[PDB]
């Protein structure tokens, strides 16, 4: 039961062992971490997990710019070469993509409710961790099998996600009028360190060598858009924190 101490014991027992055993064989080692993300999701949000198993794919195989000397090895042993570049990427992108799915059914429901403040409160932070997760991703070297389309995939929901945010705060802002901090501060981190690197990112996986990056600019450019409606539609500048 997810409330039982024993699940707690098997969950610690499950990261511990992927704490310190390494074994290099791709199989072993997806469905060990299968195993660890399905106890997890039933106890509490992985947006953590996500993030230092980001933190080590991005140590173990290297930046994009090939000048970062990063190594974070204590998080996570169950991070190799050969492990970590074709088959672990593929199932955090999943875990990534079903959190987002969440998220996109709180927003949608909270569309049409128009509970509320802790929800959103909730929401925001779980797109934070999240975008502290992609910024530590987006950054590395990935192989350009499935592993990249992915990503390209799951980012473009990223951007679904956050349009469709900037789009109910667009409904909400003219009969309450203003912001919450925390939308502010999460707008402009999205500005400040999301979205340089995106169009970083865009240039790098542009380089590297056809649908989903057209996706994935059409997406970003729709969520300026809407942030320009926004900023014109709620009497607050978010376009001070934009360039």
Known sequence: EPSSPQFVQMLSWTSKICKENSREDALFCKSLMNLLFSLH?????????????????????GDIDQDVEVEKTNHFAIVNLRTAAPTVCL????????????????????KGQVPNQPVEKAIIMQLGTLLTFFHE???????SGSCVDTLLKDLCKMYTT?????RYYLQVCQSSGGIPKNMEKLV??????????????????????????????????????FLIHLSKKSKVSLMQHMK
Request: aromatic content about 8%; hydrophobic content about 45%; overall charge neutral.
């Open 162 to 166: 956050l349009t469709a945010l900037v």
């Open 137 to 143: 991703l987006v950054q590395t070297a990935l192989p």
């Open 41 to 61: 999701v039933s106890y509490k949000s992985p947006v953590i997990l996500l993030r230092d198993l980001s933190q080590d794919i991005h140590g173990h195989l």
């Open 91 to 110: 199932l955090v992108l999943s875990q990534a993509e079903k959190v987002l799915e969440e998220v996109d059914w709180l927003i949608t429901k909270l």
């Open 188 to 225: 402009k981190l999205s500005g400040s360190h999301l979205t340089p690197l995106c169009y970083s990112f865009i240039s790098y996986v542009q380089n590297k060598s056809t649908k989903p990056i057209p996706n994935l600019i059409f997406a970003i450019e729709q969520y300026e858009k």
